[PDB]
Design a protein around this ligand. Structure first.
Ligand SMILES: C[C@@H](NC(=O)c1cc(C(=O)N[C@@H](Cc2ccccc2)[C@H](O)CNC2CC2)cc(N(C)S(C)(=O)=O)c1)c1ccccc1
Ligand SMILES: [Cl-]
Length: 368
């Protein structure tokens, strides 16, 4: 699928986007790729931060749906006007579909001043689509209206780059074997984590903990976010493996940045981290392992701590995704992980995907 290879750009900390076109003739926009949301939504007014925006009056295929949408985030809020128009992805399959568009007419703390994107492509399911499940998401319009197979894969390469392969997989982007975890239910890309090790040390928690109340795969979130009760323990252990050097008790966020002279970065006082994921077969699991490199983000070389808490559940943000090629195999209701060809890896230890493991009572790990 060489046409689609390297079709993502970005800057550290500012997200991964793909170029799309909207309306007739096409208007070109950069659009953030987010697997943790389900609306396609673009700037539609001259917000000053925006390099460009969808100008509906210039498109003959635009059709008004005469309905509004209001999407608060955690911090990031937008409001827009629903319509539909002709959408296409230059570095994607050679098709065009009529999809839903939320013309963003007002927003607070959503756009990033200095970024080079103007929109968001929500790749999750109708169930979490705003205003409600009737608003069909982009990918579902894609598949229903063309021959494009019901699947996509992401390689996010941590100025950033990567690939979104729409409709398939490209073997050039990973090594070894793909391992697959079921999508527990189609709303977010929900999965079940069944064991967590730090440096190989289990945290011997109840595994219902690791998924309280969700575990999810989300390209639109920077961090590995862990549930309150899990975050606490994770922290204690990673803080314990790391006690060669002290650090502010607030830096284990969040609340500060940490620093070492460039090259002085203390890589190894940090443990690799492992999530075991439910496998395809009863009582079988597999693990994904990431480096401190993945969860220590460049912001003198000052890094942030990419793990954090959530009353939301686990969020396998880009901290996770950067180590792997992730295949969203909607057709078979499963997600696949393979070691990424582009992940950042030193010479002492690299990211890994391995199995099979035996693990009992995996069903018991799904919070209900
Ligand atoms: C842009 C940046 N995202 C961020 O840096 C960032 C974004 C979000 C955020 O909420 N992202 C949105 C999409 C969304 C995307 C962009 C703007 C608004 C909404 C996404 O739909 C969230 N999905 C959750 C509802 C399940 C959340 C956080 N976390 C709270 S955090 C501090 O724990 O990591 C960080 C980023 C950087 C690199 C890679 C990916 C994303
Ligand atoms: Cl439609």
């Amino acid at each position: 699928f060489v046409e689609m290879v390297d079709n993502l750009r970005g800057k550290s900390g500012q997200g991964y986007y793909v170029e799309m076109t909207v309306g007739s003739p096409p208007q070109t926009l950069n659009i953030l790729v987010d697997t943790g949301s389900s609306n396609f939504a673009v700037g539609a007014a001259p917000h000053p931060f925006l390099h460009r925006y969808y100008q509906r009056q210039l498109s003959s295929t635009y059709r008004d749906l005469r309905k509004g949408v209001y999407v608060p985030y955690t911090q990031g809020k937008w409001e827009g006007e629903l319509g539909t128009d002709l959408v296409s992805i230059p570095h994607g399959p050679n098709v065009t579909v009529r999809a839903n568009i939320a013309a963003i007419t007002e927003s607070d703390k959503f756009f990033i001043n200095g970024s080079n994107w103007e929109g968001i492509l929500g790749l999750a399911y109708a169930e979490i689509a705003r205003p409600d499940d009737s608003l069909e998401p982009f990918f579902d319009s894609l598949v229903k209206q063309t021959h494009v197979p019901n699947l996509f894969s992401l390689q996010l390469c941590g100025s950033v780059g990567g690939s979104m392969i729409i409709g398939g997989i490209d073997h050039s982007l990973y090594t070894g074997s793909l391992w697959y975890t079921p999508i527990r239910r189609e709303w977010y890309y929900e999965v079940i984590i069944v064991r967590v090790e730090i440096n190989g040390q289990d945290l011997k928690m109840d595994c219902k903990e690791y998924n309280y109340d969700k575990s999810i795969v989300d390209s639109g979130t920077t961090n590995l976010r862990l549930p309150k009760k899990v975050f606490e323990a994770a922290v204690k252990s990673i803080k314990a493996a790391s006690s060669t050097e002290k650090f502010p008790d607030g830096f284990w966020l969040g609340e500060q940045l940490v620093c070492w002279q460039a090259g002085t970065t203390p890589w190894n006082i940090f443990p690799v981290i492992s999530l075991y994921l439910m496998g395809e077969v009863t009582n079988q699991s597999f693990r994904i392992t990431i480096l401190p490199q993945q969860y220590l983000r460049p912001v003198d070389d000052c890094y942030k701590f990419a793990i954090s808490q959530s009353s939301t559940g686990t969020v396998m943000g880009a901290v996770i995704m950067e180590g792997f090629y992730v295949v969203f195999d909607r057709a078979r209701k499963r997600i696949g992980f393979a070691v990424s060809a582009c992940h950042v890896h030193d010479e002492f230890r690299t990211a890994a995907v391995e199995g099979p493991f035996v693990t009992l009572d995996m069903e018991d790990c799904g919070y209900n």
